Design a protein around this nucleic acid. Structure first.
Ligand SMILES: [Mn+2]
Ligand SMILES: [Mn+2]
Lengths: 177, 177
DNA sequence: AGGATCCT
DNA sequence: AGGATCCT
């Protein structure tokens, strides 16, 4: 649906969106803070050409998940909604007379490092990491580390801390595969 | 994405499409036969208003699944593709200056009665039927009846024959729930 | 209930 | 590998 973007064009779009995201809640437009917007996906991995732009939005309250992506607003930018729910929302945005795919995802604060790790990818890397943890009866996803469907609380805050606690070598996003 | 259709408008669209569906295969446009096109979903259940139109296409060869929906063609009608693969293809068609959702699905000959049953719905009915079979260690889907992930070949040809063999009362599509 | 396509 | 949204 969306056209190809260069990495620089993608970064320009992310920079534009950082101050312009909001959601409608009880008849009020609530602005989303730049600090709670994280560029993820292939843009974070510095791929030269992008099929879409991926943003992770950190939502401060569980009760707001109902309202954020389903009532997403982008100041001054026209867009259509391809698919949308509380956790994923795919938009086709109009930018400089062309149409591009913007993927929006949400995470709660407690999920943040797991979500950054997940949404950064790439898929081949996630599969190898998850297969290794699966052998030790763990399940890793964008929400947490689980054993036997029960959350395994880890004493970590950042993505780096998570990767170290999971027992893997840290790699900059561009070198993950 | 698509507008609401009346049942009669839906039927008009199905009638139009019956002679106009084809797919591109090795540089040739292969016409799909009307006899292999079955109206399913809420249109088959005679719902007064439709959110979309559902067609089941019966594909004569397994090897053609690669080619049919991914290269679907509709003579004289403009459309865009929302999502598409070998088994489901959702199109937004232009009809009399309005946009409507056309859902296309494929089944092989051996799957036909199971596919008709599945795609006719409604969801509430499928769930109750499938839950009852699940208690007897069976799994029913659009492809067949399974026990322990193994196909259970049934001596049936039609949807009516299938429903009787599965041990349920036959109901016209409009009365299934 | 069960599966398809699409997201990383 | 694992999950979201959408299809019946
Ligand atoms: Mn991406
Ligand atoms: Mn339908």
């Amino acid at each position: 649906g969306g056209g190809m973007l260069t990495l620089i064009q993608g970064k320009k779009i992310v920079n534009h969106l950082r101050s312009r995201l909001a959601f409608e809640y009880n008849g009020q437009l609530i602005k989303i803070l730049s600090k709670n917007i994280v560029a993820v996906g292939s843009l974070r991995r510095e791929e030269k050409m992008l099929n879409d732009v991926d943003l992770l939005i950190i939502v401060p309250e569980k009760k707001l998940l109902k309202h954020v992506l389903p009532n997403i607003r982008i100041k001054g930018l026209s867009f259509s909604v391809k698919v949308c729910g509380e956790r994923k929302c795919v938009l086709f945005i109009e930018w400089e007379k062309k149409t591009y795919q913007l993927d929006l995802f949400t995470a709660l604060a407690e999920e943040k490092p797991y979500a950054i790790f997940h949404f950064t990818g790439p898929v081949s890397y996630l599969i190898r990491i998850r297969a290794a943890l699966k052998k030790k009866n763990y399940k890793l996803n964008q929400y947490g580390l689980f054993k036997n469907q029960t959350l395994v609380p880890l004493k970590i805050t950042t993505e780096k801390e998570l990767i170290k606690e999971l027992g893997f070598t840290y790699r900059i996003p561009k070198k993950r595969l």
